[PDB]
Write a protein that binds this ligand. Structure first.
Ligand SMILES: CC(C)n1cc(-c2cc(-c3ccc(CN4CCOCC4)cc3)cnc2N)nn1
Length: 258
């Protein structure tokens, strides 16, 4: 349980992509996280680009035979997932703060031409001051390079978080897909429940939303101001969907909260 100066003291995450260990340096006592895996070339390359307070820092990597070691910022708060009370959510002001921090993260990624592709509470970690960090770049990819956008075609992510275009279109724009998933995260924070299994015309809950039946759950647990924002985010047509610059002008986004 040791790689060079570091001891691998306990497990933080398991199986998802290899496993995540708490790494404590026996000399310096500094603690980091280490992702251990038995594609990784791409992930490492994207990881080396990331420099922002709401993105997980990459420290470096060591290959030791079969096993790759990715040293990363430790987020000792654990995940957003664990702060969401099932069926309840969390207090609206804590949700708003996390949403602000999530948008700052996403703007940053998009600005360097990176799309995360699997935004959800498991991948949103918290430092010891409750600062949000976007983690896990194993599905991340370049969508803008030398100022030219490339459309995506791989279907990936997590179904309850994916945008509907990803199930219907041969190719689609990256940015509105990440925006959509941020809106399902906002729903989850505010209601402690996901609104649908997947955003397909065969999913009854998704049909209900498109028919504006917001007297059903989870929408009826959400105040009208954040709900008005969720109406602009979870819009089926990605070219009509709100963009982040416009999210930042929204009334609830700018509402002062406890
Ligand atoms: C997304 C993937 C899962 N991952 C996780 C991490 C990561 C995870 C943690 C972390 C994970 C869990 C806890 C607390 N637990 C113990 C395991 O029972 C769930 C709660 C605390 C920190 C800290 N720092 C990271 N950098 N980095 N990448």
């Amino acid at each position: 349980p040791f790689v060079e100066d570091w001891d691998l003291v306990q497990t933080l995450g398991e199986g998802a992509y290899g496993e995540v260990q708490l790494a404590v340096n026996r000399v310096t006592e500094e603690a980091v996280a280490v992702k251990i895996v038995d594609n990784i070339k791409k992930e490492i390359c994207i990881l080396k680009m990331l420099n922002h307070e709401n993105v997980i820092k990459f420290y470096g990597h060591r290959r030791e035979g079969n096993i790759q070691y990715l040293f990363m910022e430790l987020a000792s708060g654990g995940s957003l997932f664990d702060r969401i009370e099932p069926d309840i959510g969390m207090p609206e002001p804590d949700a708003q703060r996390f949403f602000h921090q999530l948008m700052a993260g996403v703007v940053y990624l998009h600005g360097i031409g990176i799309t995360h592709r699997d935004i959800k509470p498991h991948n949103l970690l918290l430092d010891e001051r409750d600062n949000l960090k976007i983690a896990d770049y194993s599905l991340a990819t370049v969508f803008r390079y030398n100022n030219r956008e490339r459309l995506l075609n791989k279907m990936c992510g997590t179904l309850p978080y994916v945008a509907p275009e990803l199930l219907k279109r041969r190719e689609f724009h990256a940015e509105p897909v990440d925006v959509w998933s941020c809106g399902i995260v906002l729903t989850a924070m505010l209601a402690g429940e996901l609104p649908w299994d997947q955003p397909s015309d065969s999913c009854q809950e998704y049909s209900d939303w498109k028919e504006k039946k917001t007297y059903l759950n989870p929408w009826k647990k959400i105040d009208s101001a954040p709900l008005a924002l969720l109406h602009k985010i979870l819009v089926e047509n990605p070219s009509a969907r709100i963009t982040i610059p416009d999210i930042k002008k929204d009334r609830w986004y700018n509402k002062p909260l406890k």
